[PDB]
Design a protein around this ligand. Structure first.
Ligand SMILES: [Zn+2]
Ligand SMILES: [Zn+2]
Ligand SMILES: [Zn+2]
Lengths: 44, 33, 65, 134, 266
């Protein structure tokens, strides 16, 4: 768990020089899923 | 037969996929209908 | 873009009443002007709130991940 | 409300009147050099050069990008990158001095030249204040 | 009884139409204000997000969870975070809620204020319950979602009043009128042809004696008898939004006495 695929949303990830494609959908985009450090918000 | 450069294409025009696309096609395509 | 919870002007709850109203429309085949009166939305401050909201979210939801 | 300015119900502003979102998108690539000399995305430190920024690099994960949940601000760094020249000269992108907000969505891609292309995006909510135009 | 009397006209669970008689305008109004602004209530004020994939953004939601009315009958026996001695917050000063939702269904899953689950102990007392007046019993549609959209929060509702924010308001609209037959001339109707004909007569016109030309202008005529109507959002029972009003305003005037004495010392 770390990166993701725009269309076939499938937790992926990797490190340096591991190309930049997904495991199936070539679609070379990829996002970066939330943080585990929970965030707080003022409620107003 | 031969390759001579590249022509940018106007969106929503004949030569653009979006042209024949429909409601559902787009939303999947991510483009806004 | 989901129903505004409460009315800007007077603060009177209005979040609930979205679904209700949308039925007294399609189903109960009523007219906006009364569907509202039916739901206790007396004065326009609250009125203008529902009669105008454009529930874009529905169109948003229709995307993907 | 004199001379073309108005008074605005505060309560209403709270109940949500006229609030808005605001996104901005910083972008960047790892330069290429004919004779294989590339830059990189990473969370650097001294290691010779020191020509680094002034704001916190911490919020930076290890690929040189922030996570989409983090609250950023000041000159916090949003992207870590380094230029190789002869070792570690900085090339990061700080959140415009003025602004501040929350990272919305990060995205890592290739650019035709097989380079590491990346774009960040910060979301901010802006409630109506006094000097605001309408 | 003794001073300023009342005569509740119609009344329900969400509106206390009534007639405040033999009072001072000042006071009538003071009360009005007090009701709208300084009555203690409870509402979410800190929203910790763990996960969200909805189409609405974090703070967007947060904002909302604030206005989702909350129980507050026993609010007056819960302390203000700021005054409690805990490092930050505790059951003595706050209520914690939880909300989780996964788009299980194949057709738009809905998140209602009813899916909020209290966690902290209420040490037994009516507080922190998502007020519902909805017909089907769901109340306030917080947010919608699609496929595998998740949403895990954690809220912390605290005391708080209108001045601080509006989400703590318990009032919401408050009808107020007086001297329906402009007898004190506190207004001067604008007209094209005739005042009376163009300018609507209020329902309240009845419960008060019509003008009657002949008579001169009663200048000595101050102004008593006010036709209010306090509606409520729920948090507190319509009646209370008037009793506690009368109380709060009371305590304020109190404090001035009080401080006027520790000031007596020197
Ligand atoms: Zn893929
Ligand atoms: Zn209203
Ligand atoms: Zn406490």
């Amino acid at each position: 768990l770390k990166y993701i695929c725009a269309e076939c949303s499938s937790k992926l990830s990797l490190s340096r020089t591991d190309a930049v494609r997904c495991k199936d959908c070539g679609h070379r985009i990829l996002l970066k899923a939330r943080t585990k450090r929970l965030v707080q918000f003022e409620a107003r | 037969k031969v390759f001579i450069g590249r022509l940018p294409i106007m969106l929503r025009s004949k030569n653009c996929y979006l042209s024949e696309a429909t409601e559902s096609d787009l939303y999947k395509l991510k483009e806004c209908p | 873009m989901i129903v505004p919870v409460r009315c800007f002007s007077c603060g009177k709850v209005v979040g609930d009443k979205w679904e209700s109203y949308l039925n007294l429309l399609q189903e109960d085949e009523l007219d906006e002007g009364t569907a509202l009166s039916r739901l206790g939305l007396k004065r326009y401050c609250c009125r203008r709130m529902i009669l105008t909201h454009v529930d874009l979210i529905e169109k948003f939801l229709r995307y993907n991940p | 409300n004199q001379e073309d300015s108005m008074i605005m119900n505060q309560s209403s502003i709270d109940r949500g009147l006229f609030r808005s979102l605001f996104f901005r998108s910083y972008m960047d690539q790892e330069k290429k050099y004919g004779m294989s000399i590339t830059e990189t995305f990473e969370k650097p430190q001294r290691t010779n050069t020191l020509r680094m920024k002034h704001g916190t690099y911490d919020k930076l994960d290890d690929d040189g990008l922030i996570a989409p949940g983090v609250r950023v601000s000041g000159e916090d760094v949003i992207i870590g990158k380094t230029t190789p020249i002869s070792s570690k000269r900085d090339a990061s992108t700080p959140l415009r001095s003025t602004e501040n907000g929350i990272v919305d969505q990060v995205l890592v891609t290739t650019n035709q030249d097989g380079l590491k292309f990346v774009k960040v995006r910060v979301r901010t909510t802006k409630i109506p204040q006094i000097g605001d135009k309408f | 009884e003794e001073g300023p009397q009342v005569k509740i006209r119609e009344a329900s669970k969400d509106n206390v139409d009534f007639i405040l008689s033999n009072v001072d305008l000042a006071m009538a109004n003071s009360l009005r204000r007090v009701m709208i602004a300084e009555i203690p209530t409870l509402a979410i004020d800190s929203v910790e997000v763990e996960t969200n994939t909805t189409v609405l953004a974090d703070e967007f939601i947060a904002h909302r969870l604030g206005l989702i009315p909350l129980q507050s009958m026993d609010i007056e026996q819960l302390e203000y975070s700021r005054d409690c001695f805990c490092e930050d917050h505790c059951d003595k000063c706050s209520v914690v809620l939880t909300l989780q939702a996964f788009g299980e269904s194949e057709s738009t899953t809905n998140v209602y204020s009813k899916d909020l689950v209290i966690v902290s102990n209420l040490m037994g007392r009516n507080i922190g319950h998502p007020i519902i007046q909805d017909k089907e019993g769901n109340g306030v549609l917080i947010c919608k979602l699609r496929k595998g959209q998740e949403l895990k929060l954690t809220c912390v509702a605290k005391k708080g009043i209108a001045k601080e924010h509006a989400k703590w308001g318990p009032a919401a609209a408050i009808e107020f009128e007086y001297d329906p037959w402009n007898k004190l001339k506190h207004t001067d109707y604008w007209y094209e042809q005739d005042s009376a004909k163009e300018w609507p007569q209020s329902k309240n016109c009845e419960y008060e004696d019509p003008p009657n030309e002949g008579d001169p202008f009663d200048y000595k005529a101050q102004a008593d008898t006010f036709y209010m109507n306090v509606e409520s959002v729920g948090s507190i029972p319509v009646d209370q939004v008037v009793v506690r009003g009368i109380d709060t305003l009371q305590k304020k005037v109190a404090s001035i006495l009080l401080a006027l004495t520790q000031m007596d010392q020197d």
